[PDB]
Write a protein that binds this DNA or RNA. Sequence first.
RNA 1: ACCUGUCUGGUUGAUUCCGACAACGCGUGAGGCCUGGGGUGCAGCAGGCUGUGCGACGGGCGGCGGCAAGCUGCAGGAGG
Lengths: 113, 63, 202, 307
Amino acid sequence: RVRNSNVKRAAKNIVEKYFPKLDCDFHHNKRVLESVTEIQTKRFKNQIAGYVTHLYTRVEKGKVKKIFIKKHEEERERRENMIPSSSIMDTEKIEVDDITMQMIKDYCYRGNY
Amino acid sequence: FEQRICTFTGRPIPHTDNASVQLTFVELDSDGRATDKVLIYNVCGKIRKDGTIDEILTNTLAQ
Amino acid sequence: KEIEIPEDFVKAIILSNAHLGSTTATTNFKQYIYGRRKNDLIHVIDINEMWKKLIIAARLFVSIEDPSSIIVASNKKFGKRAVLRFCSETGATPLIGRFIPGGFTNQVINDVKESRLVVVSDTYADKQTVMEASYVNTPCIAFCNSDNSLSRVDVVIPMNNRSPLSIGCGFYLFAKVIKYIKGEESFDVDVRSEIELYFYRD
Amino acid sequence: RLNEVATFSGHKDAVMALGTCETPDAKLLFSASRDRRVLGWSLGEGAMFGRIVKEFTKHGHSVNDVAVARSGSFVVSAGCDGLGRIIDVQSGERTLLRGHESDLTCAAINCQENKIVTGSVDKTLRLWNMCGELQHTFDAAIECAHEDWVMCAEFRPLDENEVVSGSVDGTVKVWDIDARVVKSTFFDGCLGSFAVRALALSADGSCCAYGGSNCKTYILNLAESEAIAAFETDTPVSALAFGLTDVILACGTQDKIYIWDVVSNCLLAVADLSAHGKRVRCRSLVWTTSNLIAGLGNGKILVFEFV
RNA sequence: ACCUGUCUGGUUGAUUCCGACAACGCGUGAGGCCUGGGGUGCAGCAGGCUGUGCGACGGGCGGCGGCAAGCUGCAGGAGG
């Protein structure tokens, strides 16, 4: 069945606040949920903890664009710092097409068609 | 009572116009640094939405 | 006098293809056009007109007391780090992705500050922000392409926004003139290492 | 240099714990699992090897750990229903342990089979003796006791009554229980992402190891209370045991089996379990005198021979 | 006047949700819920009785859809 915003916004908060304490197995993922929240009825725990596992599977792939986890940007900034092959050194004697050089005739360098 | 005369048109800025914008510009030094004094500019509403506020502000600030 | 472009900076914008303007130019853009390529039917933008609109935009930026009041926005994902590397540097407030409409008018939402200037990457992509700025008496600088609309834009920076490096170069140079206007940093920047943070690499 | 010899029929859900015993000419294996049963496996002659001998199915929920005596007379069960049990494998009859609040996680028996420790998610690890007598609860009365669940706990073998205890805060807290005071609390070798899930003890009792949820394993000598070495793992390593008659370790993670030499501090071999299942997850491998036996999160229990 | 919010599309028994979005946040209803029914853990007592819990969430896997929501088959299971 389809979960609602009372479950999905809840389970979004659980994976967002408490991501490292979670795991892909559901029964461990429910065992954190009584320890760390207060949810009254045992069916509605299973509604939430089920969708937490359905979130934690795709956040393990990192697919969701909304939620944001402290580990997942510090790993991202390592990926952000590419060893830079910027073409400012790679381009030598820049080939600029015939009319593009004429606009730079006042102050010019690296002239090629 | 007083109403802001728009600088570029010379017209008064219309009554309670939201598109009317205050424009502030610091005077620029000879080497290109900021100075404490500021050019203060009044812009009418309709000249923004026409898009003609750009080319007039180019030639005014070119002076 | 007039500030001269560094050979360092003009090295960037040719391989940015920022002068590779567009196929179409409006009559509001023809003063930013020295010529058009007769081969590819592409208008080539004036660099000298591009550079002086940058320093006016930098002049308009610093004129507010607090740069954090300025809300700079970019809809596309090309300029996601171009506005993120900007606001860590310039000390402004970033807006990324879809601008939620009513972000300046509706007072039930208080995510960001009440703007005293906005600058956008594209008026086509951020038509919602440039309209919403006009409702609250807020100025608008914009990077504007050769085909782009320029209504409700105070300062047009004629430059391309349809390349991933292009707004990354433009937001870089706009950050470069800002501390040059304050005198915080001269043009001794060594672009080898700095502009790549603005660049969209994935 | 590892060879997967055989497999077991096994359960229909994740095996939480494995355990063996040194008996007069019989090698039992007790496999605790998530389908509320713990099986008894013999490993003798090859026709008898791999056949179910004992079976206990009266637990309420997942038997999160099991503990086999070095004498082999009895088997201590740790269940997620909240009640540990001490099962007499010849009788088939069990006692009960009522102390914990909820969801008991780990269990261990003394070298001398006098006392048993049971750890749970209620921030407690309560000790029982062989009759069901709750002697002491180690929650907050002793200072430097961890503030979350205890996922694993064991006994130091040659040491008389020292108990090791891994927890969700990443602190492997070890204490002498002779006087109820904490001896040491480790953190990455020095003294909730960092979360040790299972630990192992050596035969000589000095060498010890603990994996974790920080994708790292730390191997340390408790007598010096110093870290021997450290070994890095791809996924959050869960399973951990120690090799018999050699200074050799074997870690099991979500997908792979890392057999790490201690004294050489280099990786001897790796076995991947991706061939079997997709939700394969090795929980609680354990060594025998012949060859090490590793259980899986789908239900199969795989037998490997080391070279 | 009204419209948007309250929706192109996809989805659901559900205006249930995913998503794009001049809307953003909420609220009823829906759900959650309460009772009975099956499985068994403990406890108490004597056509066996009644307390206390556990157990299923669509979780796992395969294929569609992929910010997906979800749909569908199988295994496991007392129960889908």
